């Protein structure tokens, strides 16, 4: 009754805002910033100018590993105590290094591709692109330890990654380093001496994590280097600040109570929705305010399920706390945290859109909603044509400039570039030096057509219906 629902929606808004206030804690951006600056910005060598973000060859990777990586991992021991044996390393005198970092690689098999018979004399070795069906599963080199022997995915407790080029599996040839620099450096030097990264390697992962006992917040660090079949090196990274020891302070108890209240609110909403649908209005879908309700309920249920799943499955931390000289496997937790963050973000976005149902109090706000509702159909009808022409331009750009410009290398990238052109955020250079003909022609025709015709058509469509609605309301008011 326009008041029973308004109050319980403002209460829902308050609960949701409280939930996201503690979820997005302060002094967390600086933590990730410091880690990123330490690892991805330190030059690989004093005489070198390259860092992890600009790796260019397999020889640069070896310089980075036994180099700027060990400097940031194994910090000084701050000697003021007995230092009985192999004292632990605090990365910033505050960040504890949990367990020990792990390195691993994924490679392919020599007899993978099929070179043509025409020139089968000057071509002796070949390795296809990475795939599960074309993976090496045999000992190579000095088949001595675990760095030269395949170990299945189930034995590493790993999972896929979905990198830049392909989706890499969880198996491969791995090695767990040591807790001190003087031993990890020796292990890496031994790996480099007798070649470990051959021409058949396709990917390399380095993983570790930190605690930072000051503010209780774990952080998992993963660095990936991809070696495509065509040569080169592609780096990628992720730093996920996840939390596992929630209930330590009273504010966490408050957040738990807020989560319980949120669950009760969601239960009440789903019960009232099903009660409405069971008897009243068996069609129920021609309002645009009920699809939003079911979307919100579904997203909230998914978020609650994900949260329960990733909160009950925290036995990895318990296993790690038994033996602290082993690699802590905290990748699934980070993946599920990312998924939960995305779901929470979209739900929070849709609630504020739901808020629109109640801003209709005065007459001057009724005509705007009436105009929007009346013009939505025509706006969709013209947006269909707008998107068709936009996609035609995008596919033309992808087929023409998609191999040289690095801004049209993918269909998604073409779409993003064409949206950025509307912003006036384009350089006009790589297009013209890519092709002096059909280069500027495409740009000029796109700008002219899109901007003038379609933007003015949208303006005309909105303006005509707004004027019509205003005139109709004025005539009705003056005639009554």
């Amino acid at each position: 009754s326009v008041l029973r629902e308004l109050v319980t929606y403002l209460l829902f808004l308050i609960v949701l805002c409280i939930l996201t206030y503690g979820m997005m804690s302060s002094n967390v951006y600086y933590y990730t910033r410091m880690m990123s600056q330490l690892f991805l910005d330190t030059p690989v060598s004093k005489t070198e100018k390259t860092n992890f973000k600009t790796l260019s060859s397999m020889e640069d990777f070896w310089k980075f590993t036994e180099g700027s990586l060990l400097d940031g991992l194994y910090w000084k021991m701050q000697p003021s105590n007995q230092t009985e044996a192999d004292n632990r390393s605090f990365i910033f005198y505050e960040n504890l290094l949990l367990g020990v970092p792990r390195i691993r690689q994924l490679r392919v098999r020599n007899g993978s591709c099929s070179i043509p018979q025409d020139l089968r004399d000057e071509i002796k070795e070949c390795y296809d692109v990475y795939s599960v069906s074309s993976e090496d599963r045999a000992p190579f080199g000095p088949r001595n330890g675990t760095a030269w022997i395949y170990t299945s995915e189930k034995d590493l407790n790993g999972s896929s990654h979905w990198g830049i080029i392909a989706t890499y599996s969880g198996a491969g040839y791995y090695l767990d380093l040591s807790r001190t620099r003087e031993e990890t450096a020796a292990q890496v030097a031994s790996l480099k001496k007798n070649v470990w990264l051959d021409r058949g390697t396709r990917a390399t992962f380095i993983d570790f994590s930190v605690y930072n006992a000051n503010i209780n917040l774990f952080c998992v660090v993963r660095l990936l280097v991809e070696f495509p079949a065509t040569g080169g090196v592609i780096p990628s990274w992720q730093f996920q600040p996840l939390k596992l020891i929630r209930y330590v302070t009273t504010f966490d108890f408050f957040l738990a109570a807020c989560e319980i209240i949120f669950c009760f609110f969601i239960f009440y909403y789903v019960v009232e929705e099903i009660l409405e649908i069971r008897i009243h209005k068996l069609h129920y879908f021609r309002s645009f305010w009920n699809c939003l309700d079911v979307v919100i309920v579904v997203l909230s249920v998914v978020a609650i399920g994900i949260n329960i799943y990733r909160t009950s499955n925290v036995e990895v931390l318990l296993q790690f706390l038994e033996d602290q000289n082993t690699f802590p496997n905290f990748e699934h937790l980070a993946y599920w945290q990312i998924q939960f963050n995305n779901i929470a973000a979209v739900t929070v976005f849709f609630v504020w859109i739901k808020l629109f149902k109640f801003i209709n109090f005065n007459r001057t706000m009724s005509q705007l909603s009436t105009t929007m509702s009346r013009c939505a159909k025509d706006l969709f009808g013209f947006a269909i044509m707008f998107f068709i022409i936009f996609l035609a331009y995008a596919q033309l750009a992808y087929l023409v400039f998609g191999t040289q410009v690095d801004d049209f290398s993918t269909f998604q990238e073409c779409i993003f570039t064409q949206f950025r052109i509307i912003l006036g955020d384009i350089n006009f250079a790589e297009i013209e030096e890519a092709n002096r003909v059909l280069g500027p022609i495409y740009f000029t025709t796109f700008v002219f057509f899109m901007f003038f015709i379609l933007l003015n058509m949208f303006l005309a469509i909105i303006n005509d219906t707004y004027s019509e609605v205003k005139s109709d309301l004025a005539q009705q008011k003056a005639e009554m």
């Binding site: 795939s131 069906s133 989706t167």
Partner: peptide, 29 residues
């Protein structure tokens, strides 16, 4: 004689385009 073959990960655009065209023509017809 069914095999359940090709555990490989690849995409063949010819078949997908042919099927998409054959469905779109029906949808517009």
């Amino acid at each position: 004689r069914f095999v359940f073959p090709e555990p490989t990960a690849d995409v063949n655009y010819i078949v997908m385009l042919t099927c998409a065209v054959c469905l779109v023509t029906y949808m517009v017809m």
